[PDB]
Amino acid sequence: LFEVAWEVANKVGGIYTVLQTKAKVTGDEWGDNYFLVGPYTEQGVRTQVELLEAPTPALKRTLDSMNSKGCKVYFGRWLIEGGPLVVLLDVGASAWALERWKGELWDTCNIGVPWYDREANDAVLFGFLTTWFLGEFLAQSEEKPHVVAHFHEWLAGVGLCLCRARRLPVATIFTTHATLLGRYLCAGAVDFYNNLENFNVDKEAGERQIYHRYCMERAAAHCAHVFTTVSQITAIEAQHLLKRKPDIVTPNGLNVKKFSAMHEFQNLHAQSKARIQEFVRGHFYGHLDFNLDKTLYFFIAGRYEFSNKGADVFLEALARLNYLLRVNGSEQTVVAFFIMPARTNNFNVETLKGQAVRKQLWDTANTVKEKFGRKLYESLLVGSLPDMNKMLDKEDFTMMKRAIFATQRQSFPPVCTHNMLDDSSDPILTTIRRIGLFNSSADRVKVIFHPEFLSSTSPLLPVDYEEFVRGCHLGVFPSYYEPWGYTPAECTVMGIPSISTNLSGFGCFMEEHIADPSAYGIYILDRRFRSLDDSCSQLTSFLYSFCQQSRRQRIIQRNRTERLSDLLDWKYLGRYYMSARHMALSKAFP
Amino acid sequence: SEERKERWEQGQADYMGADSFDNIKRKLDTYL
Ligand SMILES: O=c1ccn([C@@H]2O[C@H](COP(=O)(O)OP(=O)(O)O)[C@@H](O)[C@H]2O)c(=O)[nH]1
Ligand SMILES: O=P(O)(O)OC[C@@H]1O[C@@H](O)[C@H](O)[C@H](O)[C@H]1O
Ligand SMILES: OC[C@H]1O[C@H](O)[C@H](O)[C@@H](O)[C@@H]1O
């Protein structure tokens, strides 16, 4: 098996997660005949990969057959023990002969990549290197086994045509997880779901680009022995646009972390929410005028797509929910996070300063705490109950007064934790300042935009993504166009209720698998049969309905949402890959 | 036809002329 892809060592939301979750089961069920191919980027990928430059059995012949011939191929383990013997390929090591590879592409399939975008050039170069490695392996192994080559996305789709030109006896499977042409039309301010058969692919390809990419994608789909897509909705645009109906639907699964107790995810949520509460206390210093027990943490994560990931409708719903909470005289407050990576330069002074003063207050309270504890210990040793007024003197009251005065703040807490280099052109900040949300005292919702992926080694918010998601209360992902949707998937795996859409692969998958959804925390939101304003109103209604329920109802809802983890497990969802491999073997050679 | 090669190298290809997916469709069947 060869699961060649571009995201194996570099962290990107797509491809990387599905491969990392699949590797364990796909290796334990099959064995050491599982091989993974990907690129090399000088970004720290070697930190997570245990490279094996020295010769190693289980395809030891290529190391002394081709490595010392002007190429660069490594063998790694990934630090994940699913037996993922990964074949890492360097991109910049072999780039001096791009002209001959372009000529080879011209001879074979009249395709290639223009010099405008280096991403696709690197993808094609990696495809050439992968094809050379696979051919060398077949030559060295005397063609005794019939290996199956599987391809993900267009970043590794040139392998299909390269192998078909050379007629290598392998079973070809191609699985596209996102028709990028659909992605770039859905961002073109044009309706995409009302009609699909009225699109002219060649006319649209090129004004927004995606002409060579579309051509190579369709060539791979046609020439691949087995074609596959993520959701049933994915197959719909695949057969209507690429004119190649997928052989079988292959829903995306996850490696659920089973605990010895059913309620351990609740404890993880409690701890992570405590950490988020510490961050909130840091950010809203001098403005802690709202109860923190009535605070709910909403969030929308993923790549920074405004109209595709559904951030405009979420912000409109947040403004409306703020208006209803203000006019209803409610003590509930909602802190909404926005984890969408936009380029910054560093943090702003306000956020780091807020964390600093929060922990300075923590230190001052600690000091008074040890002094009080020592005096109380003396009193208990003597045998007299404290009268509570003889312990604290004038100096510690003086320093508490000084600390309180130092934390006084007149400006409002910032909406962005980082210092972005383009604030006049950022959609999120623009609409935030348009809808009049500035974390004010009167505001019932507080927006925090964290334009960066979460990491466990960050100066502020020392939580990785999974822990932070476990800490939140509701994940709102009203995405207009996205094939499957991972973020709601692990939200429901970790027990957090989520707001999906009927235009999403996750929402569609959970639509017909459960009778009466939204009773299990899956607030499916209709975006196909409703206008934008109606969808915003429905999102506001869903948010308010989540707000009105008490703590017991929230706990019960989280339990019900967690109970659905078995649907997205790779044990249940891995059978489709096995079926695809069986069809590929039957088509190529029994 | 090096003219087509240079033209597509520039990145601005035609659609109703000699550059279309019809040629790819007609040549892909020879590879399977
Ligand atoms: O701060 C973040 C936000 C998102 N993700 C990852 O990004 C993926 C989101 O994938 P999805 O299919 O939702 O959309 P994509 O970002 O791939 O377009 C999830 O698997 C998350 O694990 C992450 O690692 N850190
Ligand atoms: O954050 P809430 O919705 O109020 O949930 C409250 C917390 O939920 C879970 O983490 C645990 O059951 C905690 O014991 C509980 O205090
Ligand atoms: O469909 C699988 C997932 O990965 C894809 O590459 C897309 O980035 C994402 O939106 C999709 O949900």
CSV table of C-alpha atoms and ligand atoms in Angstrom, one decimal, chain A residues 11-15 17-18 183 252 254 299-305 309 339-341 450 452-455 464-466 468-469 477 482-490, ligand 1:
chain,number,residue,atom,x,y,z
A,11,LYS,CA,0.8,20.4,9.6
A,12,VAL,CA,-2.2,21.3,7.5
A,13,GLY,CA,-5.8,20.9,8.6
A,14,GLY,CA,-6.8,18.6,5.8
A,15,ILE,CA,-5.1,15.4,4.6
A,17,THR,CA,-5.4,14.6,10.2
A,18,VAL,CA,-7.2,11.9,8.1
A,183,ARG,CA,-14.1,25.8,-3.4
A,252,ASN,CA,-13.8,10.3,7.0
A,254,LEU,CA,-11.2,9.5,13.5
A,299,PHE,CA,-15.6,28.9,18.9
A,300,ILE,CA,-15.2,28.5,15.2
A,301,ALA,CA,-11.9,27.0,14.0
A,302,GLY,CA,-10.2,25.9,10.8
A,303,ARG,CA,-8.6,27.7,8.0
A,304,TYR,CA,-9.2,31.4,7.4
A,305,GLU,CA,-12.1,31.2,4.9
A,309,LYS,CA,-16.2,28.4,6.9
A,339,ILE,CA,-9.3,30.5,15.6
A,340,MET,CA,-8.5,31.4,12.0
A,341,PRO,CA,-4.8,31.8,11.0
A,450,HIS,CA,-6.8,34.4,17.9
A,452,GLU,CA,-3.1,31.5,14.9
A,453,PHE,CA,-3.3,27.7,15.4
A,454,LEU,CA,-3.3,26.8,19.1
A,455,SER,CA,-0.2,25.2,20.5
A,464,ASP,CA,-3.2,22.5,22.1
A,465,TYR,CA,-6.3,22.5,19.8
A,466,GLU,CA,-7.9,19.4,21.2
A,468,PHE,CA,-9.1,24.0,24.0
A,469,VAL,CA,-12.0,22.4,22.1
A,477,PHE,CA,-19.3,25.7,12.2
A,482,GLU,CA,-16.8,22.4,2.7
A,483,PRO,CA,-16.7,18.7,1.6
A,484,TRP,CA,-16.8,16.8,5.0
A,485,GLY,CA,-15.8,18.9,8.0
A,486,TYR,CA,-13.3,17.7,10.6
A,487,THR,CA,-13.8,20.3,13.3
A,488,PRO,CA,-17.4,19.3,14.2
A,489,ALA,CA,-16.3,15.6,13.9
A,490,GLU,CA,-13.8,15.8,16.8
C,1,LIG,O1,-6.3,25.7,15.9
C,1,LIG,C1,-6.6,24.8,15.1
C,1,LIG,C2,-7.7,24.8,14.3
C,1,LIG,C3,-7.9,23.7,13.4
C,1,LIG,N1,-7.0,22.7,13.5
C,1,LIG,C4,-7.2,21.5,12.6
C,1,LIG,O2,-7.8,21.9,11.4
C,1,LIG,C5,-8.7,20.8,10.9
C,1,LIG,C6,-9.9,21.4,10.3
C,1,LIG,O3,-10.2,20.7,9.1
C,1,LIG,P1,-11.6,20.9,8.4
C,1,LIG,O4,-11.9,19.7,7.5
C,1,LIG,O5,-12.6,21.3,9.4
C,1,LIG,O6,-11.4,22.1,7.4
C,1,LIG,P2,-10.0,22.5,6.6
C,1,LIG,O7,-9.3,23.4,7.6
C,1,LIG,O8,-9.3,21.2,6.4
C,1,LIG,O9,-10.4,23.2,5.4
C,1,LIG,C7,-9.1,20.0,12.1
C,1,LIG,O10,-8.8,18.6,11.9
C,1,LIG,C8,-8.2,20.5,13.3
C,1,LIG,O11,-7.5,19.5,13.9
C,1,LIG,C9,-5.9,22.7,14.3
C,1,LIG,O12,-5.1,21.7,14.4
C,1,LIG,N2,-5.7,23.7,15.1
